[PDB]
Design a protein around this nucleic acid. Structure first.
Ligand SMILES: CC[C@@H](C)[C@H](N)C(=O)NS(=O)(=O)NC[C@H]1O[C@@H](n2cnc3c(N)ncnc32)[C@H](O)[C@@H]1O
Ligand SMILES: CC[C@H](C)[C@H](N)C(=O)NS(=O)(=O)NC[C@H]1O[C@@H](n2cnc3c(N)ncnc32)[C@H](O)[C@@H]1O
Ligand SMILES: [Mg+2]
Ligand SMILES: [Zn+2]
Length: 860
RNA sequence: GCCCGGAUGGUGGAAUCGGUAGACACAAGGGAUUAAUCCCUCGGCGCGCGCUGUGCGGGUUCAAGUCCCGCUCCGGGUACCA
């Protein structure tokens, strides 16, 4: 051990230790209690960024802490390796997605290793491999065979030029990411998994997820968006088909003054026939972007159809308008409009002069003033014929019952949640195991034809998928006849919905899951990953868990006991536009940046004097080229410093705007820790500690050493406030370094303190602590060292600090025996001159005493 | 737009259940050492004190960064980025 802390030496040596001793390789060890600490596996995008480091350090932190408490700890790592970015990337570069992907893996594999995370590499999987997706393929056919998979047509961002399907991110203000040719809606038959058939289970079970944050439970709930309502069926004049709407407000039904139908809706088609203006509007309507966000900011636009539904209850003819915000894919693609009592229908009616008919009384039972807006709050019906006077509830049911009994209504449950569309029209993904025969008929790819390999050796024209470009590939034989397999590939969310299970038995060819290894490790105890995935990935995750329950593969209803969603690590992002429309993102490292007085970026320019559009902080991603790769910091300072720096920035759950400034503290703290163990162990062995014997100065110290341990443990295991944990530790160092060390007892305290510290540090900076255990002649490898237990008896306070306020204003602070009465505290408070200052001429009206902590003298 | 969050010194942040605002650091300035270590200073405004101060506006309480009502700005998601 040198005097100078030189992580460039220590870190690899410790890592190489871990590789060889296979420290974090774990088996289904039935003696030791298991803990399965899972961080959401990365997509291999090229380089680690800081966001991943927050994730995996939080992850390594809890894993190592947990091993330290004596548990058998699974911490796995792998590559969620299908996805878009490799497609674009592999052409820029003239490769196939596969070799670019595998090389991204090796590069990053290397980055995660040097950061010393304690992963069970024996368990690494790469989702692009047939060893892997063959199982999601077989599973899908099981689901198919079991009625949970279907085909409906679905709108897709089609580029009319390229004539190629684009993901929303490749749509830039309504244009194509390559050439500024305009994206259009195309409906395309696609595969769906009836996630909706598990809506109630997904919705109800959240109330059992005691250890999932509320943010995520609430987000998922609002997303599933279950409602009870009524579908209502209307006849239209001179049209042969009925129209159906879903409303949660049948109560407002006598206030229906129009219907609005989707551009795609046959009424709209039939009416277009003879109405050039409607025909225009529908044609316009494939400029409606396949994202909800636009579907909602876009201005509502609609053309009347000339058609007239019959209100089943009033008999009045009502206009059918075609509108741009009502979609066929989702529900009936026909809504019922009550302008008086829905803000969306208030706006619409205003704009196009439709009727704004009131039918619900203000809370006071008076007629609502509609002249500005809808009355949306529920209430007594009026001007609703036979239903007048009824409260919201009774009107709901009353209108429900009549429409039911007229056979045109029905009570129906609905969910905002739509089914999951897994068909992707792209190459780099697992092919969907479906098969169309000469028959014309469609079945699962036969068992014995799984997996359906995605070939890796391809020429990528960029525009088309190799497996759609080549006529031979689709060709198979099924049931004896020629058939064509599906050329669409899976939404890559599919691979990230079940990896957590495959990690328990990645090397198992007999099935999807060696359910004995799955049930040894499952459910995951803690699941760590971005807040970004609160909803989609997590909801697919639970879903899939449950489909795997429902296949007898796993025992528990839910996949993850605890969920830790870290905040997003963000960074300034910047683009210029290429000579034809191409958005070019420019790393913040390369941006030359002019700053405000509130410190905001005001101008930005790239190395070539390109003006840049600054976009603000957004999560770090290769998409905006704004990720900071830990690599340089790591090689200058070592993993431990980057790691502790990351955990110290702020608490896990809070989003964090990245800044390079602050590292060195973390680095200097580690030098202070090093120096102090160096110096303390240079004076050799210590006497056993004699507890009853120590100066009060030593007694205070030990009690801090012990309160820290308690705090850091409570911070790490209950709150996940690693930053406070660390600060609490730092302050102990500051104390420890101002403590005497010639005393036999000085040295013995120092030594207990320093073991407790070096262990407390370990989950954050295990390389330096591994080394520092050895010096302190710690028992064995620090990795399996037990977490330190605070001794209650070393933690009793004699006194306690009481804050003193007059009329709520702190005037004084006063140490006071823990066992102090209000009256002694009062009299004590009194002795303080600044308290006296404020009590002259005034009466104590009210005294408030928070025992042992605070005294307020309401004075008048 | 909707849903979820967030906002605190020059900076990141602490304050755990309504009780001390700024713990712990970074930056900066000054000093002791001829890059490294160490001191001191450090929310504002006028002092071994007074007032003020937790994005903005109201409000409840003895007491509000925290709770309630209305907002602003920022981030995440919004179903094909992952
Ligand atoms: C008071 C009744 C009105 C608010 C409205 N006609 C209505 O029926 N509201 S609803 O909750 O019952 N609707 C159920 C679903 O239908 C869609 N929807 C109904 N009306 C509109 C509208 N004007 N614009 C966009 N979407 C609309 C909603 O997305 C909701 O998902
Ligand atoms: C199962 C997880 C996903 C489906 C996917 N593999 C994925 O998110 N892959 S990743 O490379 O983008 N990220 C892996 C983990 O890192 C977190 N993360 C990614 N980017 C950031 C960021 N800017 N700030 C904070 N955290 C971030 C992800 O949420 C995921 O936990
Ligand atoms: Mg600030
Ligand atoms: Zn194009």
């Amino acid at each position: 051990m040198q005097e100078q802390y030189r992580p460039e030496e220590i870190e690899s040596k410790v890592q190489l230790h871990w590789d060889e001793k296979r420290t974090f390789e774990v088996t289904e060890d039935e003696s030791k209690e298991k803990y399965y600490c899972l961080s959401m596996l990365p997509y291999p995008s090229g380089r680690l960024h800081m966001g991943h480091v927050r994730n995996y350090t939080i992850g390594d932190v809890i894993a190592r802490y947990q091993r330290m408490l004596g548990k058998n700890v699974l911490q796995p790592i792998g590559w969620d390796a299908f996805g878009l970015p490799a497609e674009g990337a592999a052409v820029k570069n003239n490769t196939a997605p596969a070799p670019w992907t595998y090389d991204n893996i090796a590069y990053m594999k290397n980055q995660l290793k040097m950061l010393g995370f304690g992963y069970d590499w024996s368990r690494e999987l790469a989702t692009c491999t047939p060893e892997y997706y063959r199982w999601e393929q077989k599973f899908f056919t099981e689901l198919y065979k079991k009625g949970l998979v279907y085909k409906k047509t679905s709108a897709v961002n089609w580029c009319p030029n390229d004539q190629t399907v684009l993901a929303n991110e490749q749509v830039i203000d309504g244009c194509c990411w390559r050439c500024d040719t305009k994206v259009e809606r195309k409906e395309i038959p696609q595969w769906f998994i009836k996630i909706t058939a598990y809506a109630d289970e997904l919705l109800n079970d959240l109330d059992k997820l005691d250890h999932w944050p509320d943010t995520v439970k609430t987000m998922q709930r609002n997303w599933i968006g279950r409602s009870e309502g009524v579908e209502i069926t209307f006849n239209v004049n001179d049209y042969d088909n009925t129209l159906t709407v879903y409303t949660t407000r049948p109560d407002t039904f006598m206030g229906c003054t129009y219907l609005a139908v989707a551009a795609g809706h046959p009424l709209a088609q039939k009416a277009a026939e003879n109405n050039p203006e409607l025909a225009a509007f529908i044609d316009e309507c494939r400029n409606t972007k396949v994202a909800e966000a636009e579907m909602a900011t876009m201005e509502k636009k609609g053309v009347d159809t000339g058609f007239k539904a019959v209100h089943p209850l009033t008999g009045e003819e009502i206009p059918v308008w075609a509108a741009n915000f009502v979609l066929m894919e989702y529900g009936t693609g026909a809504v019922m409009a009550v302008p008086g009592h829905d803000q969306r229908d208030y706006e619409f009616a205003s704009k196009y002069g439709l009727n704004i008919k009131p039918v619900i009384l203000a809370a006071d039972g008076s007629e609502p003033d509609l002249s500005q807006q809808a009355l949306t709050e529920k209430g007594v019906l009026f001007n609703s014929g036979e239903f007048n006077g009824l409260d919201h509830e009774a009107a709901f049911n009353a209108i429900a019952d009549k429409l039911t009994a007229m056979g045109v209504g029905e009570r129906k449950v609905n969910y905002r949640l739509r089914d999951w569309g897994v068909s992707r029209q792209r190459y780099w993904g697992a092919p969907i195991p479906m098969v169309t025969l000469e028959d014309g008929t469609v079945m699962p790819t036969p068992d014995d034809q799984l997996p359906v390999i995605l070939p890796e050796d391809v020429v990528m024209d960029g525009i088309t998928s190799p497996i759609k470009a080549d006529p031979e590939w689709a060709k198979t034989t099924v049931n004896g006849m020629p058939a064509l397999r599906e050329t669409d590939t899976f939404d890559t969310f599919m691979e990230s919905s079940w990896y957590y299970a495959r990690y328990t038995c990645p090397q198992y060819k007999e099935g999807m899951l060696d359910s004995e290894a799955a049930n040894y490790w499952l459910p995951v105890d803690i699941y760590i990953g971005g807040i970004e995935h609160a909803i989609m990935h997590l909801l697919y995750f639970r879903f899939f868990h449950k489909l795997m329950r429902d296949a007898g593969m796993v025992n528990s209803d839910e996949p993850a006991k605890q969920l830790l969603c870290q905040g997003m690590v963000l960074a300034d992002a910047f683009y210029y536009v290429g000579e034809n429309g191409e958005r070019n993102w420019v790393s913040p490292v390369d941006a030359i940046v002019e700053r405000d007085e509130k410190g905001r970026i005001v101008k930005a320019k790239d190395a070539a004097g390109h003006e840049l559009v600054y976009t603000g902080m957004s999560k770090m991603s290769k998409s905006k080229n704004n990720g900071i790769d830990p690599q340089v910091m790591v090689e200058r300072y070592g993993a431990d410093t980057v790691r502790l720096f990351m955990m110290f920035a702020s608490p896990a759950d809070m989003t964090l705007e990245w800044q390079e400034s602050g590292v060195e503290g973390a680095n200097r703290f580690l030098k202070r820790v090093w120096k102090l163990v160096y110096e303390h162990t240079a004076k050799g062995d210590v006497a056993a500690l004699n507890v009853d014997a120590l100066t009060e100065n030593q007694k205070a110290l030990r009690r801090d050493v012990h309160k820290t341990i308690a705090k850091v443990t409570d911070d790490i295991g209950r709150r996940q406030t690693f930053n406070t944990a660390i600060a609490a530790i730092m302050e102990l160092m500051n104390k420890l370094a101002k403590a005497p060390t010639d005393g036999e007892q000085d040295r013995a305290l120092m030594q207990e303190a320093l073991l407790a510290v070096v262990r407390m540090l370990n989950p954050f900076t295990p390389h330096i602590c591994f080394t520092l255990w050895q010096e302190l002649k710690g028992e064995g490898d620090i990795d399996n060292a037990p977490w330190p237990v605070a001794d209650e008896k070393a933690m009793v306070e004699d006194s306690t600090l009481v804050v003193v306020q007059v009329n709520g204003k702190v005037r004084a602070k006063i140490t006071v025996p823990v066992d102090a009465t209000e009256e002694q505290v009062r009299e004590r408070a009194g002795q303080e001159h600044l308290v006296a200052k404020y009590l002259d001429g005034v009466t104590v009206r009210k005294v408030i005493y928070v025992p042992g902590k605070l005294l307020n003298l309401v004075v008048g």
